Design an enzyme around this catalytic site. Structure first.
Site, PDB file in Angstrom:
ATOM      1  N   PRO B  90       0.783  -1.242   0.000  1.00 34.16           N
ATOM      2  CA  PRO B  90       0.000   0.000   0.000  1.00 34.16           C
ATOM      3  C   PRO B  90       0.807   1.280   0.000  1.00 34.16           C
ATOM      4  CG  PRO B  90      -0.341  -1.188   2.016  1.00 34.16           C
ATOM      5  CD  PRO B  90       0.618  -2.022   1.234  1.00 34.16           C
ATOM      6  N   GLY B 114       4.232  -9.954   0.056  1.00 32.12           N
ATOM      7  CA  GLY B 114       4.540  -9.948   1.491  1.00 32.12           C
ATOM      8  C   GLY B 114       3.389 -10.578   2.271  1.00 32.12           C
ATOM      9  N   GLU B 117       3.560  -8.104   8.704  1.00 35.36           N
ATOM     10  CA  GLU B 117       3.624  -6.650   8.604  1.00 35.36           C
ATOM     11  C   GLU B 117       4.368  -6.170   7.382  1.00 35.36           C
ATOM     12  OE1 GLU B 117       1.798  -4.622  10.624  1.00 35.36           O
ATOM     13  OE2 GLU B 117       1.145  -6.725  11.032  1.00 35.36           O
ATOM     14  N   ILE B 134      -2.596  -1.902  -5.055  1.00 35.32           N
ATOM     15  CA  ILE B 134      -3.850  -2.021  -5.830  1.00 35.32           C
ATOM     16  C   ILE B 134      -4.962  -1.029  -5.373  1.00 35.32           C
ATOM     17  CG2 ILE B 134      -3.440  -4.342  -6.755  1.00 35.32           C
ATOM     18  CD1 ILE B 134      -5.818  -5.194  -4.712  1.00 35.32           C
ATOM     19  N   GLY B 135      -4.693  -0.317  -4.265  1.00 38.24           N
ATOM     20  CA  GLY B 135      -5.677   0.632  -3.756  1.00 38.24           C
ATOM     21  C   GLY B 135      -5.393   1.029  -2.333  1.00 38.24           C
ATOM     22  N   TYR B 137      -6.202   0.666   0.736  1.00 36.82           N
ATOM     23  CA  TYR B 137      -6.833  -0.197   1.740  1.00 36.82           C
ATOM     24  C   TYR B 137      -5.821  -1.269   2.057  1.00 36.82           C
ATOM     25  CZ  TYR B 137      -8.092  -2.217  -2.906  1.00 36.82           C
ATOM     26  OH  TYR B 137      -8.105  -2.592  -4.189  1.00 36.82           O
ATOM     27  N   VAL B 138      -5.939  -1.929   3.191  1.00 41.46           N
ATOM     28  CA  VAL B 138      -4.879  -2.899   3.632  1.00 41.46           C
ATOM     29  C   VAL B 138      -5.442  -4.305   3.590  1.00 41.46           C
ATOM     30  CG1 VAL B 138      -3.305  -3.620   5.463  1.00 41.46           C
ATOM     31  CG2 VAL B 138      -3.873  -1.170   5.117  1.00 41.46           C
ATOM     32  N   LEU B 139      -4.733  -5.163   2.852  1.00 44.00           N
ATOM     33  CA  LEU B 139      -5.041  -6.597   2.798  1.00 44.00           C
ATOM     34  C   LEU B 139      -4.076  -7.437   3.646  1.00 44.00           C
ATOM     35  CD1 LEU B 139      -5.747  -7.009  -0.949  1.00 44.00           C
ATOM     36  CD2 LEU B 139      -7.278  -6.230   0.855  1.00 44.00           C
ATOM     37  N   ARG B 155      -5.096  -8.972 -19.757  1.00 44.30           N
ATOM     38  CA  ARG B 155      -6.095  -8.517 -20.752  1.00 44.30           C
ATOM     39  C   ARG B 155      -5.448  -7.855 -21.984  1.00 44.30           C
ATOM     40  NH1 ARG B 155      -9.015  -4.809 -19.784  1.00 44.30           N
ATOM     41  NH2 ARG B 155     -11.050  -5.414 -20.700  1.00 44.30           N
ATOM     42  N   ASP B 162     -14.939   0.723 -23.113  1.00 42.29           N
ATOM     43  CA  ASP B 162     -14.419  -0.058 -21.986  1.00 42.29           C
ATOM     44  C   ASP B 162     -13.967   0.877 -20.889  1.00 42.29           C
ATOM     45  OD1 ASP B 162     -13.899  -2.363 -20.675  1.00 42.29           O
ATOM     46  OD2 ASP B 162     -11.878  -2.674 -21.586  1.00 42.29           O
TER      47      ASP B 162
HETATM   48  C1  LIG Z   1      -0.732  -6.635   6.490  1.00 48.32           C
HETATM   49  S1  LIG Z   1      -0.046  -6.017   4.946  1.00 48.32           S
HETATM   50  C2  LIG Z   1       1.376  -5.220   5.695  1.00 48.32           C
HETATM   51  C3  LIG Z   1       0.811  -4.020   6.473  1.00 48.32           C
HETATM   52  C4  LIG Z   1       1.836  -2.937   6.874  1.00 48.32           C
HETATM   53  N1  LIG Z   1       1.583  -2.516   8.254  1.00 48.32           N
HETATM   54  C5  LIG Z   1       1.639  -1.812   5.816  1.00 48.32           C
HETATM   55  O1  LIG Z   1       0.718  -0.980   5.943  1.00 48.32           O
HETATM   56  O2  LIG Z   1       2.345  -1.714   4.781  1.00 48.32           O
HETATM   57  C6  LIG Z   1       0.710  -7.582   4.367  1.00 48.32           C
HETATM   58  C7  LIG Z   1       1.237  -7.664   2.934  1.00 48.32           C
HETATM   59  O3  LIG Z   1       0.155  -7.366   2.042  1.00 48.32           O
HETATM   60  C8  LIG Z   1       0.554  -6.423   1.093  1.00 48.32           C
HETATM   61  N2  LIG Z   1      -0.576  -5.490   0.868  1.00 48.32           N
HETATM   62  C9  LIG Z   1      -1.550  -5.105   1.781  1.00 48.32           C
HETATM   63  N3  LIG Z   1      -2.367  -4.256   1.147  1.00 48.32           N
HETATM   64  C10 LIG Z   1      -1.946  -4.071  -0.144  1.00 48.32           C
HETATM   65  C11 LIG Z   1      -2.420  -3.246  -1.144  1.00 48.32           C
HETATM   66  N4  LIG Z   1      -3.484  -2.418  -0.975  1.00 48.32           N
HETATM   67  N5  LIG Z   1      -1.754  -3.268  -2.324  1.00 48.32           N
HETATM   68  C12 LIG Z   1      -0.673  -4.098  -2.465  1.00 48.32           C
HETATM   69  N6  LIG Z   1      -0.175  -4.917  -1.469  1.00 48.32           N
HETATM   70  C13 LIG Z   1      -0.806  -4.854  -0.300  1.00 48.32           C
HETATM   71  C14 LIG Z   1       1.681  -5.622   1.855  1.00 48.32           C
HETATM   72  O4  LIG Z   1       2.617  -4.695   1.170  1.00 48.32           O
HETATM   73  C15 LIG Z   1       2.281  -6.595   2.805  1.00 48.32           C
HETATM   74  O5  LIG Z   1       3.446  -7.088   2.206  1.00 48.32           O
HETATM   75  C1  LIG Z   2     -14.559  -7.383 -18.180  1.00 46.35           C
HETATM   76  S1  LIG Z   2     -15.259  -6.708 -16.668  1.00 46.35           S
HETATM   77  C2  LIG Z   2     -16.698  -5.980 -17.453  1.00 46.35           C
HETATM   78  C3  LIG Z   2     -16.161  -4.806 -18.287  1.00 46.35           C
HETATM   79  C4  LIG Z   2     -17.209  -3.768 -18.740  1.00 46.35           C
HETATM   80  N1  LIG Z   2     -16.965  -3.407 -20.139  1.00 46.35           N
HETATM   81  C5  LIG Z   2     -17.038  -2.589 -17.737  1.00 46.35           C
HETATM   82  O1  LIG Z   2     -16.136  -1.744 -17.905  1.00 46.35           O
HETATM   83  O2  LIG Z   2     -17.747  -2.457 -16.707  1.00 46.35           O
HETATM   84  C6  LIG Z   2     -15.980  -8.260 -16.013  1.00 46.35           C
HETATM   85  C7  LIG Z   2     -16.505  -8.285 -14.577  1.00 46.35           C
HETATM   86  O3  LIG Z   2     -15.432  -7.920 -13.702  1.00 46.35           O
HETATM   87  C8  LIG Z   2     -15.851  -6.942 -12.798  1.00 46.35           C
HETATM   88  N2  LIG Z   2     -14.743  -5.973 -12.620  1.00 46.35           N
HETATM   89  C9  LIG Z   2     -13.778  -5.612 -13.551  1.00 46.35           C
HETATM   90  N3  LIG Z   2     -12.980  -4.714 -12.959  1.00 46.35           N
HETATM   91  C10 LIG Z   2     -13.407  -4.477 -11.678  1.00 46.35           C
HETATM   92  C11 LIG Z   2     -12.951  -3.595 -10.719  1.00 46.35           C
HETATM   93  N4  LIG Z   2     -11.907  -2.752 -10.928  1.00 46.35           N
HETATM   94  N5  LIG Z   2     -13.617  -3.575  -9.539  1.00 46.35           N
HETATM   95  C12 LIG Z   2     -14.679  -4.422  -9.357  1.00 46.35           C
HETATM   96  N6  LIG Z   2     -15.159  -5.298 -10.313  1.00 46.35           N
HETATM   97  C13 LIG Z   2     -14.528  -5.278 -11.484  1.00 46.35           C
HETATM   98  C14 LIG Z   2     -16.996  -6.204 -13.598  1.00 46.35           C
HETATM   99  O4  LIG Z   2     -17.954  -5.267 -12.958  1.00 46.35           O
HETATM  100  C15 LIG Z   2     -17.574  -7.235 -14.499  1.00 46.35           C
HETATM  101  O5  LIG Z   2     -18.727  -7.724 -13.877  1.00 46.35           O
END
Ligand SMILES: C[S@@+](CC[C@H](N)C(=O)[O-])C[C@H]1O[C@@H](n2cnc3c(N)ncnc32)[C@H](O)[C@@H]1O
Ligand SMILES: C[S@@+](CC[C@H](N)C(=O)[O-])C[C@H]1O[C@@H](n2cnc3c(N)ncnc32)[C@H](O)[C@@H]1O
Lengths: 239, 239
Positions: B90, B114, B117, B134-135, B137-139, B155, B162
């Protein structure tokens, strides 16, 4: 306890969160339950058709309405009253940590995963409560977005287990060895001084947010200590 | 052809993209190759320890440096020259469709996932080329982010197939039946008039972007036709 119903053509994908890691342990221990329904199982034709052609032509296919609608209604019945139905889509509300905290307030969610070009607009109107996106990019299906949402909310369930927590990027972290390719661990972290360490971590979080994501700081009401540590980091940068 | 090396404690999670749907077909047909290395397999102690305590204390654990570093070096050797190494975090560059198009220019990537932590800051300095999120928020792990990145880039690989394409949200789509819970398909889409349909779809994309994500329109150099259709939609809204 949280219950998540999922509608997906590829329910086996969800093994990635139900069988592994912290989320997998949450599922085995009954902190999180994930139940899936597959539109294919609601088809009636010989070849179990789950797509359909869009009106207006154009390339691509849509999820077929009847199997998908039937699957959604089965999930809604299983959930009983009070389950919010979410459609994963890039046209939805972009997920962020505030959005995660709001979704985590639900004891039940049903997550609808599209494939192909998506789903019929009128099903969104008639069956979906909210549309959510995981980010401004297009994936092949809603399964990775649904799993992302599940994973993010599961972190809030007591017992399952910080960036964005207080709105800031996390500080750097270090573990053994003390020297790695000639790079040493900051001596403050070896000092054993809890208060110095706390300040260093906070100042690092501020510095990293400022340098990488300065727009995130706009949104924040810094404490007096945070304002001070941010100013110190900015002066060190200007030095 | 694209090659993606993945470093993960839970390589089985990647079955979610390698065995299912459009990405699974890409992998079976050799359009996309995904190869995984697991830090656990690079441990030497009896209990195959893959975490370690952070200097400075605090709660949580980090990935242990030695197994992770060894796994990364094995992947780099397998990739040969020219593979960009990405750490999912993140604190990284937030993914969007422009970022996806840039990553898709790489014939080889290695994606470091990872857990806990995170990973030691000095490995980021010494082994990672780029950090990507990817956004905001923390996974619980980097696997869902790595799979998200894989899916989004795949893709673009010719033969795999699109919103955001031209920067706009997609238009609504409709399939059978013609009337669903009394909601009818827009008659323009039943008209068979290709040019009317094209305009309707574009105007809908403009309208939906304006209403849901107006900040996205700021970034765009609209064509004359797009300016006109957007103005028509805005007048209809004010009517
Ligand atoms: C619990 S998270 C680590 C949390 C740490 N305290 C932080 O905020 O960076 C565990 C792994 O998931 C990856 N991760 C969590 N959220 C992500 C996100 N939104 N995008 C990409 N990687 C993510 C992290 O970089 C980390 O290696
Ligand atoms: C190929 S996408 C559909 C693409 C369509 N032309 C559009 O832009 O909404 C296929 C499925 O993945 C989901 N999807 C694709 N990207 C997403 C994203 N960034 N977040 C949540 N769902 C996603 C869609 O809502 C869709 O139901």
């Amino acid at each position: 306890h949280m219950w998540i119903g999922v509608i997906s053509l590829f329910p086996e994908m969800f093994k990635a969160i139900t069988e592994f890691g912290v989320t997998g342990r949450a599922v085995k221990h009954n902190l999180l339950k994930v139940e899936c329904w597959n539109p294919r199982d609601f088809t009636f034709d010989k070849h179990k058709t789950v797509d359909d052609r869009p009106y207006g032509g154009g390339p691509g296919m849509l999820m077929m309405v009847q199997p998908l609608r039937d699957a959604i209604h089965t999930a809604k019945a299983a959930a009983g009253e009070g389950a919010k139905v979410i459609y994963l889509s890039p046209q939805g509300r972009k997920l962020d940590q505030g959005g995660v905290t709001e979704l985590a307030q639900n004891q039940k969610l049903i997550l609808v995963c599209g494939r192909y070009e998506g789903i019929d607009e009128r099903l969104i109107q008639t069956e979906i409560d909210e549309e959510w996106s995981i980010g401004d990019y297009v994936l092949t299906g809603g399964e990775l977005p649904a799993m992302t949402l599940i994973d993010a909310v599961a972190r809030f369930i007591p017992g399952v287990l910080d960036s964005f927590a207080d709105g800031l990027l996390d500080c750097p972290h270090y573990t053994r060895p003390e020297v790695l390719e000639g790079l040493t661990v900051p001596p403050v972290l070896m000092s054993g001084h809890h208060e110095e360490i706390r300040k260093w971590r906070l100042k690092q979080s501020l510095q990293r947010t400022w340098l990488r994501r300065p727009e995130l700081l706009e949104g924040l009401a810094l404490t007096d200590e945070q304002r001070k540590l941010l100013k110190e980091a900015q002066a060190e940068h200007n030095s």
